[PDB]
Amino acid sequence: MRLPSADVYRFAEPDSEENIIFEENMAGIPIIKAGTVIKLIERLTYHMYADPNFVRTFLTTYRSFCKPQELLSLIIERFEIPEPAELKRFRKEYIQPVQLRVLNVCRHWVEHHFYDFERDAYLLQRMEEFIGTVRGKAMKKWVESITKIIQRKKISSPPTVEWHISRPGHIETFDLLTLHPIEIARQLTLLESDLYRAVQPSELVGSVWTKEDKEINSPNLLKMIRHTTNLTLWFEKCIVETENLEERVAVVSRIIEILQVFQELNNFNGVLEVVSAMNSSPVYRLDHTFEQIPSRQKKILEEAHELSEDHYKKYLAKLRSINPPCVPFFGIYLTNILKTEEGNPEVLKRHGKELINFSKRRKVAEITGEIQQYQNQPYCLRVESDIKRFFENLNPMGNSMEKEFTDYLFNKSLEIEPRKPLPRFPKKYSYPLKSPGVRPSN
Amino acid sequence: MTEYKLVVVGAGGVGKSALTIQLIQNHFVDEYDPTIEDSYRKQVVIDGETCLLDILDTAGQEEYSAMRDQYMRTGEGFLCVFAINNTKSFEDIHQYREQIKRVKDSDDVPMVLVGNKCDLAARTVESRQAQDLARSYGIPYIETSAKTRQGVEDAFYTLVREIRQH
Amino acid sequence: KRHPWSVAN
């Protein structure tokens, strides 16, 4: 087949070592390793076959190497194909499929990455203009579908809720030992699952949660992490502010039961909130307290902690093998995205020519894809509005700065079990310390 | 053979990850896949003794502040890292080290101070300043370049010698 | 010995 000259239609320039390179050791379609942006756009809108995986990876990651306005200009340019009888075949097997691929890209862009348009109204103006100029009978159905999407974008049986000492409605008595431990774990799992599910790839690609505009670009991610940090600190606080030893043993024991239920729910964020609290300086040194923890709960906590050993070897295997719903620990994804982006070149060079390194972007898109896969399935659990609100509004730090607060926790640790004879402290809980355990009531 | 658990500690946002990445990459491979064991474990020969460096770098998890103790607890030696173009990251060092000392329950934990130079921003931390801080802690100072790999090996090897001579 | 939640010796 014969195409226009590159001096009229830039996407006609043949492939070469200086244009496109492929992955050499890996659904019938070759894996692009690197290429100029012209070639990447060509293959993104290739006439010989659709390439949904390339489209998804591209639209998830292109902003590191191409700005949204530039991409719109480039796919418009691709669409406007000039002709060089044998034209009938050219129109059938080149113009038509390339233009359909362009509309497919527009459709996926507006559908899954509409945030580009919400942040640049002029981008949306250009897109609606472009779509409006599209006059074709083969195109009409795709054009109408795109317009519809754009218009829309401008706009089983759960178990019984468990109760312990606090009764329904008695918000004022809600606390670590008065709410039922199963229900604490369930409502924290609902909170943390929603927090996990709200995080979008746009907060992650580009490592933007580490940069000076993180608060603007990664608000859901930060809110999620901040909740996790808050719960860890609240667990440590509950422990070291319980100065009576017997009561402290009951507190630590209840927290291990909450951990057990987190494990039952595959809430690994919850597992690690607890594990991080137990590893904290103020808590880890409380030998007189762990002394009285029953050996079964010691084993529960031991298994959970071992999930984090060896750079999370066992956490990773267990996550690979569980079935949803679950709440992954996000920290590992963040490290892998950041180290992938920082540990690989943006550009490869071949024959003095610069080519966008696309494989590093594919690696980042695989990570964000795995996150999304665990955001699909929700938990079959009922919300308890008041328990939910209680955990949303936990604020163990109060007005203190981080250093002041963690120093105060460590000094409480030193006071309740000195480095010095062990003092006695009076009880603070009026109610019974015995746990209802972690099996339901029916 | 002996395995050393090293932990990288430092402010986020200033490319501290380059120190460990550059150590692990063969000197001329720019690939890095952080999802495999070879990505944080390296066998090396130091002063004629062969050993295995296991390096924990949580770069990217800085917001999980209540996990620092947990991660620090895993190490026997620590690289405290700041960017030489970022004064705030140099100021953060003192509190990081306080925290390492409390986590390990010891006033002299094997540790090294590392100033890291990224390609193109301008120095705001003079080498004398860092040299003086490190002497005040009784620990070595190493400067590294993320562009050239200069100093990287020296940084990790000095830390291993601090562990061996402890 | 090890962690406070490990088996004593």
Coordinates of C-alpha atoms in Angstrom, one line a residue:
Chain A
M1 CA 0.0 0.0 0.0
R2 CA 1.2 3.6 -0.8
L3 CA 1.0 6.5 1.6
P4 CA 1.6 10.3 1.2
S5 CA 5.1 11.8 1.6
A6 CA 6.3 12.5 5.1
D7 CA 6.8 16.1 4.0
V8 CA 2.9 16.4 3.9
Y9 CA 1.8 13.9 6.5
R10 CA 4.4 13.3 9.2
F11 CA 3.0 9.9 10.2
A12 CA 4.1 8.4 6.9
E13 CA 7.8 8.3 7.7
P14 CA 8.8 4.7 7.8
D15 CA 9.9 3.0 11.0
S16 CA 13.6 2.8 11.7
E17 CA 16.1 2.2 14.4
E18 CA 15.9 6.0 14.9
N19 CA 12.1 6.0 15.2
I20 CA 10.7 3.0 17.1
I21 CA 12.3 0.1 19.0
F22 CA 10.6 -2.9 20.4
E23 CA 11.0 -5.1 23.4
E24 CA 13.2 -7.9 22.2
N25 CA 12.4 -10.7 24.7
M26 CA 8.6 -10.6 25.1
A27 CA -1.9 -11.0 21.8
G28 CA 0.1 -11.1 18.6
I29 CA 1.1 -7.5 19.0
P30 CA 4.8 -6.4 19.5
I31 CA 5.7 -4.5 22.6
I32 CA 6.9 -1.0 21.9
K33 CA 9.9 -0.2 23.9
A34 CA 10.7 3.4 22.8
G35 CA 9.9 5.8 20.0
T36 CA 9.4 9.4 19.0
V37 CA 6.1 10.9 20.0
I38 CA 5.1 10.9 16.2
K39 CA 5.7 7.1 16.1
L40 CA 4.0 6.6 19.5
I41 CA 0.9 8.4 18.1
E42 CA 1.1 6.4 14.9
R43 CA 1.1 3.1 16.8
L44 CA -1.6 4.5 19.1
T45 CA -3.8 4.9 16.0
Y46 CA -2.3 2.2 13.9
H47 CA -4.2 1.2 10.8
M48 CA -3.4 -2.5 10.8
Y49 CA -5.1 -3.4 14.2
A50 CA -6.5 -1.8 17.3
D51 CA -4.3 -1.9 20.4
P52 CA -6.4 -1.3 23.5
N53 CA -3.6 -2.1 25.9
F54 CA -1.4 0.5 24.3
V55 CA -4.2 3.0 24.3
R56 CA -4.8 2.5 28.0
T57 CA -1.2 2.7 29.0
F58 CA -0.6 5.8 26.8
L59 CA -3.6 7.7 28.1
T60 CA -2.7 6.8 31.7
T61 CA 0.9 8.0 31.3
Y62 CA 1.5 10.4 28.4
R63 CA 1.6 13.6 30.4
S64 CA 5.3 13.1 31.4
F65 CA 6.3 13.4 27.8
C66 CA 3.5 15.2 26.0
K67 CA 1.1 17.9 27.1
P68 CA -2.6 17.4 26.7
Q69 CA -3.0 20.3 24.2
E70 CA -0.1 18.8 22.2
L71 CA -1.7 15.3 22.2
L72 CA -5.0 16.8 21.0
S73 CA -3.1 18.6 18.2
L74 CA -1.2 15.4 17.3
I75 CA -4.3 13.2 17.0
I76 CA -6.1 15.9 15.0
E77 CA -3.1 16.0 12.7
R78 CA -3.1 12.2 12.4
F79 CA -6.9 12.3 11.5
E80 CA -6.4 14.8 8.6
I81 CA -4.8 12.4 6.2
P82 CA -4.0 13.8 2.7
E83 CA -4.2 11.5 -0.3
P84 CA -1.3 10.6 -2.6
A85 CA -8.1 3.7 -8.8
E86 CA -5.9 2.4 -5.9
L87 CA -7.2 5.3 -3.8
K88 CA -10.3 3.1 -3.1
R89 CA -8.1 0.6 -1.2
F90 CA -6.2 3.5 0.5
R91 CA -9.5 5.0 1.8
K92 CA -10.7 1.5 2.9
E93 CA -7.5 0.2 4.6
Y94 CA -5.8 3.4 5.7
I95 CA -7.9 6.5 6.1
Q96 CA -11.0 4.8 7.5
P97 CA -9.2 2.7 10.2
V98 CA -6.8 5.4 11.3
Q99 CA -9.7 7.8 11.7
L100 CA -11.7 5.3 13.7
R101 CA -8.7 4.7 15.9
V102 CA -8.4 8.5 16.4
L103 CA -12.1 8.6 17.5
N104 CA -11.5 5.6 19.8
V105 CA -8.6 7.4 21.5
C106 CA -10.8 10.5 21.9
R107 CA -13.5 8.3 23.4
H108 CA -11.2 6.6 25.9
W109 CA -9.6 10.0 26.7
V110 CA -12.9 11.7 27.6
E111 CA -14.3 8.6 29.3
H112 CA -11.5 7.5 31.6
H113 CA -9.3 10.6 31.8
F114 CA -11.8 13.4 31.8
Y115 CA -9.8 15.3 34.4
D116 CA -7.6 16.7 31.6
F117 CA -10.7 18.5 30.3
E118 CA -11.9 19.6 33.7
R119 CA -8.6 21.4 34.3
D120 CA -8.3 23.0 30.8
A121 CA -11.6 24.2 29.5
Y122 CA -9.9 25.3 26.3
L123 CA -8.8 21.6 25.8
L124 CA -12.5 20.7 26.0
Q125 CA -13.4 23.6 23.6
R126 CA -10.9 22.2 21.1
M127 CA -12.2 18.7 21.5
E128 CA -15.8 19.6 20.9
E129 CA -14.8 21.7 17.8
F130 CA -12.8 18.8 16.4
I131 CA -15.6 16.2 17.0
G132 CA -18.0 18.7 15.4
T133 CA -16.0 18.9 12.2
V134 CA -16.1 15.1 11.8
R135 CA -18.3 14.4 8.8
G136 CA -18.6 10.8 7.9
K137 CA -21.1 8.0 7.8
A138 CA -18.8 5.4 9.3
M139 CA -17.9 8.1 11.9
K140 CA -21.4 9.2 12.9
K141 CA -22.0 6.5 15.5
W142 CA -18.6 7.0 17.2
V143 CA -19.0 10.8 17.1
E144 CA -22.4 10.7 18.7
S145 CA -21.1 8.3 21.4
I146 CA -18.2 10.7 22.2
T147 CA -20.6 13.7 22.4
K148 CA -22.9 11.7 24.8
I149 CA -20.0 10.9 27.1
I150 CA -18.7 14.5 27.1
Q151 CA -22.2 15.7 28.0
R152 CA -22.6 13.2 30.8
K153 CA -19.2 14.2 32.3
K154 CA -20.3 17.8 32.6
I155 CA -22.4 16.9 35.6
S156 CA -25.9 -10.3 49.3
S157 CA -26.9 -10.0 53.0
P158 CA -24.7 -8.3 55.6
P159 CA -24.0 -9.7 59.1
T160 CA -25.6 -8.1 62.1
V161 CA -24.0 -5.1 63.6
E162 CA -22.3 -6.1 66.9
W163 CA -22.5 -4.1 70.2
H164 CA -20.5 -4.5 73.5
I165 CA -20.8 -2.1 76.4
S166 CA -21.8 1.1 74.5
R167 CA -25.4 0.8 73.3
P168 CA -26.7 2.1 69.9
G169 CA -27.0 5.8 70.0
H170 CA -24.7 6.2 73.1
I171 CA -22.0 8.1 71.1
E172 CA -20.7 9.6 74.3
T173 CA -19.4 6.3 75.7
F174 CA -17.8 5.1 72.4
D175 CA -14.2 4.0 73.1
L176 CA -11.7 1.3 72.2
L177 CA -12.9 -1.1 75.0
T178 CA -16.7 -0.2 75.0
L179 CA -17.4 -0.7 71.3
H180 CA -17.4 -4.3 70.1
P181 CA -14.0 -5.3 68.7
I182 CA -15.6 -7.0 65.6
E183 CA -17.5 -3.8 64.8
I184 CA -14.5 -1.6 65.2
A185 CA -12.7 -3.7 62.7
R186 CA -15.7 -3.7 60.3
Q187 CA -16.3 0.0 60.4
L188 CA -12.6 0.8 60.1
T189 CA -12.5 -1.6 57.1
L190 CA -15.4 0.2 55.5
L191 CA -13.7 3.6 56.0
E192 CA -10.3 2.3 54.8
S193 CA -11.8 0.5 51.9
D194 CA -13.5 3.7 50.7
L195 CA -10.3 5.6 51.2
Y196 CA -8.4 3.0 49.2
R197 CA -11.0 3.1 46.4
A198 CA -11.1 6.8 45.9
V199 CA -7.4 7.1 44.9
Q200 CA -7.1 7.7 41.2
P201 CA -4.1 7.1 39.0
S202 CA -3.9 10.8 38.4
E203 CA -2.6 11.2 42.0
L204 CA 0.1 8.6 41.4
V205 CA 1.6 8.8 37.9
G206 CA 4.5 11.3 37.8
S207 CA 5.2 10.6 41.5
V208 CA 3.1 13.8 42.2
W209 CA 2.2 12.8 45.8
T210 CA 5.9 13.5 46.6
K211 CA 6.2 16.9 45.0
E212 CA 5.5 20.4 46.2
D213 CA 1.9 20.4 44.8
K214 CA 1.1 17.0 46.4
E215 CA -1.8 18.5 48.4
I216 CA -3.4 19.6 45.1
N217 CA -2.6 16.6 43.0
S218 CA -2.9 13.7 45.4
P219 CA -5.7 14.7 47.9
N220 CA -7.4 11.3 48.2
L221 CA -4.1 9.5 48.6
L222 CA -2.9 11.8 51.3
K223 CA -6.3 11.6 53.1
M224 CA -6.0 7.8 53.1
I225 CA -2.5 7.8 54.5
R226 CA -3.4 10.4 57.1
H227 CA -6.3 8.2 58.3
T228 CA -3.9 5.2 58.6
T229 CA -1.3 7.3 60.5
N230 CA -4.1 8.6 62.7
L231 CA -5.3 5.1 63.7
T232 CA -1.8 4.0 64.5
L233 CA -1.2 7.0 66.7
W234 CA -4.6 6.4 68.4
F235 CA -3.7 2.8 69.1
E236 CA -0.4 3.9 70.7
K237 CA -2.1 6.6 72.7
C238 CA -4.8 4.2 74.0
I239 CA -1.9 1.9 75.2
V240 CA 0.5 4.4 76.9
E241 CA -2.3 6.5 78.5
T242 CA -3.6 3.3 80.2
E243 CA -1.2 3.5 83.1
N244 CA -2.6 0.6 85.2
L245 CA -0.8 -2.5 84.0
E246 CA -3.8 -4.9 84.0
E247 CA -5.9 -2.4 82.1
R248 CA -3.0 -1.8 79.6
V249 CA -2.9 -5.6 79.0
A250 CA -6.6 -5.6 78.3
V251 CA -6.1 -2.6 75.9
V252 CA -3.2 -4.3 74.0
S253 CA -5.2 -7.5 73.9
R254 CA -8.3 -5.9 72.5
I255 CA -6.2 -4.2 69.8
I256 CA -4.8 -7.6 68.9
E257 CA -8.4 -8.9 68.6
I258 CA -9.2 -6.0 66.2
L259 CA -6.1 -7.1 64.2
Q260 CA -7.4 -10.7 64.1
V261 CA -10.7 -9.5 62.6
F262 CA -8.7 -7.2 60.2
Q263 CA -7.0 -10.4 59.0
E264 CA -10.3 -12.2 58.6
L265 CA -11.5 -9.3 56.4
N266 CA -8.2 -9.1 54.4
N267 CA -7.9 -5.5 55.5
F268 CA -4.1 -5.3 55.2
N269 CA -4.1 -1.6 55.8
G270 CA -5.7 -2.3 59.1
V271 CA -3.3 -5.2 59.8
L272 CA -0.4 -2.8 59.3
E273 CA -1.9 0.1 61.3
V274 CA -1.8 -2.3 64.2
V275 CA 1.6 -3.7 63.4
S276 CA 3.1 -0.2 63.1
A277 CA 1.6 0.7 66.5
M278 CA 3.1 -2.4 68.1
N279 CA 6.5 -1.6 66.6
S280 CA 6.5 2.0 67.7
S281 CA 9.1 3.0 70.3
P282 CA 6.6 3.8 73.0
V283 CA 4.8 0.4 72.8
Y284 CA 7.5 -2.0 71.7
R285 CA 9.5 -1.6 74.9
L286 CA 6.5 -2.4 77.2
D287 CA 7.9 -5.8 78.4
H288 CA 5.7 -6.0 81.4
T289 CA 2.6 -5.6 79.2
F290 CA 3.5 -8.2 76.5
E291 CA 4.4 -10.5 79.3
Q292 CA 0.7 -10.9 80.2
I293 CA -0.6 -11.2 76.6
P294 CA -1.9 -14.8 76.2
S295 CA 0.3 -16.8 73.8
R296 CA -2.4 -17.2 71.2
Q297 CA -2.7 -13.5 70.8
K298 CA 1.2 -13.3 70.8
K299 CA 1.1 -15.7 67.8
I300 CA -1.6 -13.6 66.0
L301 CA 0.5 -10.5 66.4
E302 CA 3.7 -12.4 65.5
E303 CA 2.2 -13.7 62.2
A304 CA 1.0 -10.2 61.3
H305 CA 4.4 -8.6 62.0
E306 CA 6.1 -11.3 60.0
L307 CA 4.0 -10.1 57.0
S308 CA 6.4 -7.1 56.9
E309 CA 9.7 -8.9 57.2
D310 CA 12.0 -9.3 54.2
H311 CA 10.7 -6.3 52.3
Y312 CA 7.1 -7.6 52.7
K313 CA 7.8 -11.0 51.2
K314 CA 4.9 -12.7 53.0
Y315 CA 2.5 -9.7 52.6
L316 CA 3.1 -9.9 48.9
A317 CA 2.4 -13.6 48.6
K318 CA -0.7 -13.4 50.8
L319 CA -2.1 -10.5 48.8
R320 CA -1.4 -12.4 45.5
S321 CA -3.4 -15.3 46.8
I322 CA -6.5 -13.8 48.5
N323 CA -9.7 -13.1 46.8
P324 CA -11.4 -9.7 47.0
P325 CA -12.8 -7.8 48.7
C326 CA -9.6 -6.6 50.4
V327 CA -7.8 -3.4 51.4
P328 CA -4.2 -3.5 50.3
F329 CA -1.4 -1.6 52.0
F330 CA -0.6 1.3 49.6
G331 CA 3.0 2.1 50.7
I332 CA 4.5 -0.6 48.5
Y333 CA 2.8 0.7 45.4
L334 CA 4.0 4.2 46.1
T335 CA 7.6 3.1 46.5
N336 CA 7.5 1.0 43.3
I337 CA 6.0 3.8 41.2
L338 CA 8.5 6.3 42.6
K339 CA 11.5 4.0 42.1
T340 CA 10.4 3.0 38.6
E341 CA 10.0 6.6 37.6
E342 CA 13.3 7.8 39.2
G343 CA 15.4 4.7 38.4
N344 CA 14.8 4.7 34.6
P345 CA 15.6 7.3 31.9
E346 CA 12.8 9.4 30.4
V347 CA 14.6 9.0 27.0
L348 CA 16.7 6.5 25.2
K349 CA 19.1 7.4 22.5
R350 CA 19.7 5.6 19.2
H351 CA 21.9 6.9 16.4
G352 CA 22.0 10.3 18.2
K353 CA 18.2 10.5 18.1
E354 CA 16.1 10.8 21.2
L355 CA 13.2 8.3 21.8
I356 CA 10.6 8.4 24.5
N357 CA 11.2 5.6 26.9
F358 CA 7.8 4.0 26.9
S359 CA 8.6 0.8 28.7
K360 CA 9.1 2.6 32.0
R361 CA 5.6 4.1 31.6
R362 CA 4.2 0.7 30.9
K363 CA 5.8 -0.5 34.2
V364 CA 4.1 2.4 36.0
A365 CA 0.8 1.6 34.3
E366 CA 1.0 -2.0 35.4
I367 CA 1.3 -0.8 39.0
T368 CA -1.7 1.5 38.7
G369 CA -3.6 -1.3 37.0
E370 CA -3.0 -3.6 40.0
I371 CA -4.3 -0.9 42.4
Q372 CA -7.4 -0.5 40.3
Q373 CA -8.1 -4.3 40.2
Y374 CA -8.4 -4.3 44.0
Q375 CA -10.7 -1.3 43.9
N376 CA -13.4 -3.1 42.1
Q377 CA -15.1 -5.3 44.8
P378 CA -16.8 -3.7 47.9
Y379 CA -17.4 -5.2 51.3
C380 CA -20.7 -6.9 52.3
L381 CA -20.9 -5.0 55.6
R382 CA -23.4 -2.5 57.0
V383 CA -22.3 1.0 57.8
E384 CA -23.0 2.2 61.4
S385 CA -23.2 6.0 61.0
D386 CA -22.2 6.8 64.6
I387 CA -19.2 4.4 64.8
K388 CA -18.1 5.5 61.4
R389 CA -18.2 9.2 62.5
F390 CA -16.4 8.3 65.7
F391 CA -13.4 7.0 63.7
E392 CA -13.5 9.7 61.1
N393 CA -13.1 12.3 63.9
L394 CA -10.4 10.5 66.0
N395 CA -7.7 13.2 66.5
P396 CA -5.1 11.7 68.9
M397 CA -2.6 14.4 68.2
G398 CA -5.0 17.3 69.0
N399 CA -3.1 20.5 68.4
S400 CA 0.4 19.2 69.0
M401 CA 3.0 19.0 66.4
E402 CA 4.3 15.5 65.4
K403 CA 7.6 15.7 67.4
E404 CA 5.9 17.1 70.6
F405 CA 3.2 14.3 70.4
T406 CA 5.5 11.4 69.7
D407 CA 7.9 12.6 72.5
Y408 CA 4.9 12.8 74.8
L409 CA 3.9 9.2 73.9
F410 CA 7.5 8.0 74.6
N411 CA 7.6 9.9 77.9
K412 CA 4.3 8.2 78.9
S413 CA 5.9 4.9 78.0
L414 CA 8.9 5.6 80.2
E415 CA 6.6 6.7 83.1
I416 CA 4.4 3.7 83.1
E417 CA 7.3 1.2 82.8
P418 CA 10.6 2.9 83.8
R419 CA 13.9 1.8 82.4
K420 CA 14.1 1.8 88.2
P421 CA 11.4 -0.2 90.0
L422 CA 8.0 -0.7 88.4
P423 CA 5.4 1.6 90.0
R424 CA 1.7 1.0 90.5
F425 CA -1.0 3.1 88.9
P426 CA -4.7 3.2 89.8
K427 CA -7.4 2.0 87.4
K428 CA -9.2 4.3 85.0
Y429 CA -12.0 2.1 83.5
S430 CA -15.3 1.8 85.4
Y431 CA -16.6 -1.0 83.2
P432 CA -15.5 -4.6 82.8
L433 CA -12.3 -5.2 80.8
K434 CA -13.3 -8.7 79.6
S435 CA -13.7 -8.9 75.8
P436 CA -16.7 -10.4 74.1
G437 CA -14.3 -12.0 71.7
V438 CA -14.3 -12.0 67.9
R439 CA -17.0 -14.5 67.1
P440 CA -20.5 -13.2 66.2
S441 CA -23.6 -13.4 68.3
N442 CA -25.6 -15.1 65.5
Chain B
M1 CA 28.6 -15.0 54.7
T2 CA 27.7 -11.9 56.6
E3 CA 24.6 -9.9 55.7
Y4 CA 24.2 -6.2 56.6
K5 CA 20.8 -4.6 57.1
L6 CA 21.1 -1.0 55.9
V7 CA 18.3 1.5 56.2
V8 CA 18.1 4.8 54.1
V9 CA 16.5 7.7 56.0
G10 CA 15.8 11.1 54.7
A11 CA 13.4 13.7 53.5
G12 CA 11.1 12.9 50.6
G13 CA 10.8 15.1 47.5
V14 CA 14.5 15.5 46.7
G15 CA 15.4 12.2 44.9
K16 CA 17.1 10.3 47.8
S17 CA 16.1 7.0 46.0
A18 CA 19.0 7.6 43.5
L19 CA 21.6 6.7 46.1
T20 CA 20.4 3.1 46.5
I21 CA 19.3 2.7 42.9
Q22 CA 22.7 3.8 41.6
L23 CA 24.4 1.3 44.0
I24 CA 22.4 -1.6 42.8
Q25 CA 22.4 -1.0 39.1
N26 CA 25.5 -2.4 37.4
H27 CA 27.5 0.6 36.7
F28 CA 26.2 0.8 33.0
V29 CA 22.7 -0.6 33.3
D30 CA 20.0 2.1 33.7
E31 CA 17.2 -0.4 34.1
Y32 CA 15.7 -0.7 37.5
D33 CA 12.8 -2.9 38.5
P34 CA 12.1 -2.4 42.2
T35 CA 9.7 -5.4 42.3
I36 CA 12.4 -8.1 42.7
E37 CA 15.0 -9.2 45.3
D38 CA 18.0 -8.3 43.2
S39 CA 16.6 -4.7 43.4
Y40 CA 17.6 -4.3 47.1
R41 CA 20.2 -7.1 47.7
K42 CA 23.8 -6.9 46.5
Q43 CA 26.8 -9.1 47.1
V44 CA 30.0 -7.0 47.4
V45 CA 33.7 -7.2 48.6
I46 CA 34.8 -4.6 51.1
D47 CA 38.3 -4.5 52.5
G48 CA 38.7 -8.0 51.2
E49 CA 35.7 -9.5 53.0
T50 CA 32.8 -10.6 50.9
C51 CA 29.3 -9.8 52.3
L52 CA 25.7 -9.1 51.3
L53 CA 24.1 -5.7 51.6
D54 CA 20.4 -5.7 52.2
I55 CA 19.2 -2.1 51.7
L56 CA 15.8 -0.8 52.8
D57 CA 14.7 2.5 51.2
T58 CA 11.1 3.4 51.7
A59 CA 11.3 6.4 49.4
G60 CA 7.7 7.5 48.7
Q61 CA 6.2 6.4 52.0
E62 CA 7.2 9.6 53.9
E63 CA 3.5 10.5 54.7
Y64 CA 3.2 7.2 56.7
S65 CA 5.1 8.9 59.5
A66 CA 4.0 6.5 62.2
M67 CA 5.8 3.7 60.3
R68 CA 9.3 5.1 60.6
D69 CA 10.0 3.3 63.9
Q70 CA 8.9 0.0 62.3
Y71 CA 11.1 0.4 59.3
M72 CA 14.1 1.8 61.3
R73 CA 13.8 -1.2 63.7
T74 CA 14.9 -3.5 60.9
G75 CA 18.3 -2.0 60.3
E76 CA 21.7 -2.3 62.0
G77 CA 23.2 0.6 60.0
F78 CA 21.7 3.8 58.7
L79 CA 22.4 6.2 55.9
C80 CA 20.9 9.7 56.8
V81 CA 20.5 11.4 53.4
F82 CA 19.7 15.0 52.5
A83 CA 19.9 16.9 49.2
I84 CA 22.7 19.5 49.0
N85 CA 20.3 21.8 47.1
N86 CA 17.6 21.6 49.8
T87 CA 18.3 23.2 53.2
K88 CA 15.1 21.9 54.8
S89 CA 16.2 18.3 54.1
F90 CA 19.6 19.0 55.8
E91 CA 17.8 20.5 58.8
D92 CA 15.6 17.4 59.1
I93 CA 18.7 15.2 59.8
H94 CA 18.9 16.0 63.5
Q95 CA 15.4 14.7 64.3
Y96 CA 15.8 11.6 62.0
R97 CA 18.9 10.7 64.0
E98 CA 17.2 11.3 67.4
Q99 CA 14.5 8.9 66.2
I100 CA 17.1 6.3 65.1
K101 CA 18.8 6.5 68.5
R102 CA 15.5 6.0 70.3
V103 CA 14.3 3.1 68.0
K104 CA 17.6 1.3 68.5
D105 CA 17.9 2.3 72.2
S106 CA 21.5 3.3 71.8
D107 CA 23.5 6.5 71.6
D108 CA 25.9 5.3 68.9
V109 CA 24.2 3.4 66.1
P110 CA 26.4 2.8 63.1
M111 CA 25.5 5.6 60.7
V112 CA 26.7 7.8 57.9
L113 CA 25.7 11.3 56.8
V114 CA 25.2 11.6 53.0
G115 CA 24.8 14.8 51.1
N116 CA 23.4 14.0 47.6
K117 CA 23.8 16.3 44.6
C118 CA 21.2 16.1 41.8
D119 CA 22.0 17.1 38.3
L120 CA 21.3 20.8 38.0
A121 CA 19.9 22.7 41.1
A122 CA 22.2 25.0 43.0
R123 CA 24.0 24.0 46.2
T124 CA 22.5 25.5 49.4
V125 CA 24.3 23.3 51.9
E126 CA 28.0 23.9 52.0
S127 CA 30.3 21.0 52.6
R128 CA 31.7 22.6 55.6
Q129 CA 28.3 22.9 57.3
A130 CA 27.7 19.1 56.7
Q131 CA 31.2 18.2 57.7
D132 CA 30.6 20.1 61.0
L133 CA 27.2 18.5 61.7
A134 CA 28.8 15.0 61.0
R135 CA 31.7 15.7 63.3
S136 CA 29.3 16.9 66.0
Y137 CA 27.6 13.5 65.8
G138 CA 30.9 11.5 65.6
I139 CA 30.0 10.0 62.2
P140 CA 31.4 10.2 58.7
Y141 CA 30.2 12.5 55.9
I142 CA 30.0 11.4 52.2
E143 CA 28.9 13.5 49.3
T144 CA 27.5 11.7 46.2
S145 CA 26.4 12.7 42.8
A146 CA 23.2 11.2 41.2
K147 CA 24.5 12.2 37.8
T148 CA 27.9 10.5 37.8
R149 CA 27.7 7.9 40.6
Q150 CA 30.7 9.5 42.3
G151 CA 30.7 8.8 46.0
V152 CA 27.8 6.2 46.1
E153 CA 30.0 3.2 46.8
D154 CA 32.0 5.1 49.3
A155 CA 28.8 6.0 51.2
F156 CA 27.7 2.4 51.6
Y157 CA 31.2 1.0 52.2
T158 CA 31.9 3.5 54.9
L159 CA 28.7 2.4 56.6
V160 CA 29.7 -1.2 56.4
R161 CA 33.0 -0.3 58.0
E162 CA 31.2 1.6 60.8
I163 CA 29.3 -1.6 61.5
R164 CA 32.4 -3.8 61.5
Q165 CA 34.3 -1.5 63.8
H166 CA 31.4 -0.8 66.1
Chain C
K1 CA 15.0 -12.1 73.2
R2 CA 13.7 -11.0 69.6
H3 CA 10.2 -9.3 69.8
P4 CA 8.2 -9.0 73.1
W5 CA 5.3 -11.0 71.1
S6 CA 7.8 -13.9 70.2
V7 CA 8.1 -17.3 71.9
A8 CA 10.5 -16.8 75.0
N9 CA 13.5 -19.5 75.1

